[PDB]
Every structure is written in structure tokens, then in C-alpha cells.
Amino acid sequence: RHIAIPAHRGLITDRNGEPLAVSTPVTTLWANPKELMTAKERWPQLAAALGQDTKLFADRIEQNAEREFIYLVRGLTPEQGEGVIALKVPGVYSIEEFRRFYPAGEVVAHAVGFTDVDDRGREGIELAFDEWLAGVPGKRQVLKDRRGRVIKDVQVTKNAKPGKTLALSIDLRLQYLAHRELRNALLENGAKAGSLVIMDVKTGEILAMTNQPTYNPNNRRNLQPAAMRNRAMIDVFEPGSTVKPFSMSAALASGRWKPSDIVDVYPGTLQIGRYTIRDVSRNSRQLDLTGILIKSSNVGISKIAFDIGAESIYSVMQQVGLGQDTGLGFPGERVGNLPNHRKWPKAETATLAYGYGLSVTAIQLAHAYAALANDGKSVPLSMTRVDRVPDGVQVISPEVASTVQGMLQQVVEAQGGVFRAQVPGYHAAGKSGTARKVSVYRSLFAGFAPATDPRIAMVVVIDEPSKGLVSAPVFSKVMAGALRLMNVPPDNL
């Protein structure tokens, strides 16, 4: 008959060459039952080396004595298979298969994914590039002589073609750092889940994408689906104040607003017909445009939104990628939602402006802050190593981008700003947020550094630390280590 020859699945490395998924050869054992039936006295020794019960093994050989080929076991270790082969039992033959091994384990479990018992990809990169990584299986022909004995020198009908190598955009050094500090932030704040994304704002490469809780892809025998979800690409949420800078970009591009314009926010609430907009910091009477970001004033950005109209705000969000398909082709990836109505009443205009009228993923939010950090130039996302700068698209003018960049640095360094997120030795820009979802609380921070010449954008999501500024220190530590890892010279002395 015919026996398939499994193809060596292509190697997955990080951007530097660190192995992330390796096809390790294993030993699979198959038997010719008619040949096995002539050496019954060896079956107990055989079943022991295979790791099978003596009687169950004997039953299986009898019930399949008619066939010329059955599998005894698949995927033994090299030493185990050599134990079986050392018995020299008639009718027992071996083939070399491959088992996928993930050296980093749970650190990069969601990005890389994992494979079948048949070594085809089921999640992550392993599934998104499965065509690329799989290769073609070969065919071996079982030749029997007279009296049904398999010929030792097997006959290969068709050769297997190996799969192709893939280098991800992930940087394993930054992946470890992000996986570590995010893991600490949850066990310290007693949080349920979380996510952390790091992007190269110039290349669009994804330098790290870690989720908690995670799982070990080498030990899936008790895998729980709560750890298998790639939250960075699947969990959608209302971005809240983290998309206020993109409302600000619309206001500065309208020509009707300058950073020094004041807006009346007395008394921290605002009545829009039957709805009531509420600022958290109601102890403010008037704010300029930077202060509206510093204080997360829903009232402040709503009055600006009424002036410039929602379609201009919708346009900046759409063009920085929010609610749009990322093009990564990852399985289970969610596009989120940007609201679609032709006419924009005041309440819909307001909620969109302060980030409650839309749904985004953490990956989209990092992509949006990368465009802002890249001087308003949008570059496509990439999970594979880019062979250097791709063509970007100017979606925010460089001067409006520089102005909002400066405002976001003021969110971190100015009076009343979030001093938590400061990277010691560096100038960091960023914006915090909070997302609530009702069914009948996520801490958000998004930023980039160094603000004098941005290199990387980061988004930190931390699920349910209370029944929320817990993400800001996570940004601080990871951004510090990341800059100190990929060697960014300080800009704050």
C-alpha cells in the first residue's frame, strides 16, 4: 500500500533568528500484522517498549491481522523508538515523523500558535502561514514479497518537499520583558486578563504581542480556552480617552482651534438633550486644549466636536486604522466598529469624540498611535520581519502630528499629568483611558517614546483590576526596558 512521509515543517524565528517553532524528528512505529502474527511470544516485550497494555495490544493485533499495515504508535521520543527497534521483532518498522517544539513556551504562545497531531497549524502564525510553513508530504510504497513479508529497503514513490522558513517581526528580548512585567502587573493588581503590544512606528513591525493569561504550547493536554484567546487581536472595547488625541488632531486640522484656546467645562457635566455628559474631574472651570487631554474632559472634547462636526473626527479615526481591517490575516482577528450614520446628532458626535461610540482592538490602537508617533505617517502592520522601511501614507499633517505629540508629552510631564508613566531618562508621550462594558472595566494606556524622535508605540490593556490608572506604570517599566534593550539613546538628562 501507500504510507505518507511527513514533511519537515518550516522553522519560525524571531526578527533576529531566535527559534520560536522547531520541527523535531520523532519516531513512529508501524506493523505488518501478518508478519506480527508469526512472533506472538515477543508481543509482551514489544508492548512494553511501545508503552501499551499487554492484553489490549494483543487484542488490537488480532482484530487487524487481516490488514497489511497498522500504526503501533506515533511520535515516540528517539530513545523510546530505539528501545522498540532494539527488540528486533518481526513485522515492526519505523518512520521518522516530526513534532513541533516551542522553545519560548508561553512567552510567545499567542503570536506563534500551535499545530495539530498531524502537524498542521491551528492558531497564530502557524495557521496564518500554514501554506508557507507546511510543505508537501511524500509517499512511500509498502512492497511485499511472496508470503507477505515487507521488503526492508522501503520504496519511496514520491519525495516530500520541506516547508519554508519564516522570520517574525517579534523581538524575543522585548517579548520576554513585556511578558514578564505584564504578568507582574496582573498578579499585583489582582487583575483577570491583559494585553501588551509594541510596534516599530517607522516600519509597522510588531515587536511584541503578549497576553495574560497565557498557556504552554508544549503541554496542551490540559489546555483551557480562557488562556488561548489572543486578546490583543480579538478583544474589542470602547477606547475611551485614548482616542481623544485623534479628536484633537481633527480640531487642529480644521483651522478653527489652537492649543491655547480655552473651553468652559463648568461644572464638569454637560446636558445634551436627554443625555448627560460627565467629566470625572469636575473640579475644573476652564481648560485649554492640552488640559482637556490631561484631565480626560469628556465635556471639553464634546464642545470642540460640536464645533468641527463628527465627520472630520470619523475621518481621522478611519485613516489611522480604528475599526478597520489590519490586513494581518490572523485567525479570529476582529475589525471592531466605527459607527455609521449619515447625519450626526450632538449625542452621537460627543460619544465618538471622547471614545465611547466605537470599538477597537489593542492592535488597532497601537497602529493608530504609531501613525501619530511617525509624524502622521501611517505604515501597515506586519507580523513578519520587514526588509526595511515600507511606503507610508500621510494621514495627519506633520505639524498637527508634532503638536499632538507635544500635548501627549504634556499628559505625562506637565502639572497634573500622569507622572506614573514617565520613563526615567526618557521623554515619554502617552494617554490613559478606561473602557466599561455592561451586560444584563479595562485600564488603558497608549503612548510612544522617545517624544523627541519616536521609535516605538505601546498599548497596555489590563482587565478588571477593580470591581483605574494601573496600566501607566506598566508602560513606564516596559518602555524603559525596551528602549534600553534595542538601544535608544536617552533624551532626558
UniProtKB/Swiss-Prot annotation:
It comes from the Bacteria. Keywords: Carboxypeptidase, Cell cycle, Cell division, Cell inner membrane, Cell membrane, Cell shape, Cell wall biogenesis/degradation, Hydrolase, Membrane, Peptidoglycan synthesis, Protease, Septation, Transmembrane, Transmembrane helix. It is found in: Cell inner membrane. It comes from Pseudomonas aeruginosa (strain ATCC 15692 / DSM 22644 / CIP 104116 / JCM 14847 / LMG 12228 / 1C / PRS 101 / PAO1). It catalyses: Preferential cleavage: (Ac)2-L-Lys-D-Ala-|-D-Ala. Also transpeptidation of peptidyl-alanyl moieties that are N-acyl substituents of D-alanine. The active site is at S241 (acyl-ester intermediate). The keyword DNA damage does not apply. PANTHER family: PEPTIDOGLYCAN D,D-TRANSPEPTIDASE, PEPTIDOGLYCAN D,D-TRANSPEPTIDASE FTSI. The lineage of its organism: Bacteria, Pseudomonadati, Pseudomonadota, Gammaproteobacteria, Pseudomonadales. Its EC number is 3.4.16.4. Pfam families: PBP_dimer, Transpeptidase. One of its GO terms (biological process) is proteolysis. This is Peptidoglycan D,D-transpeptidase FtsI.
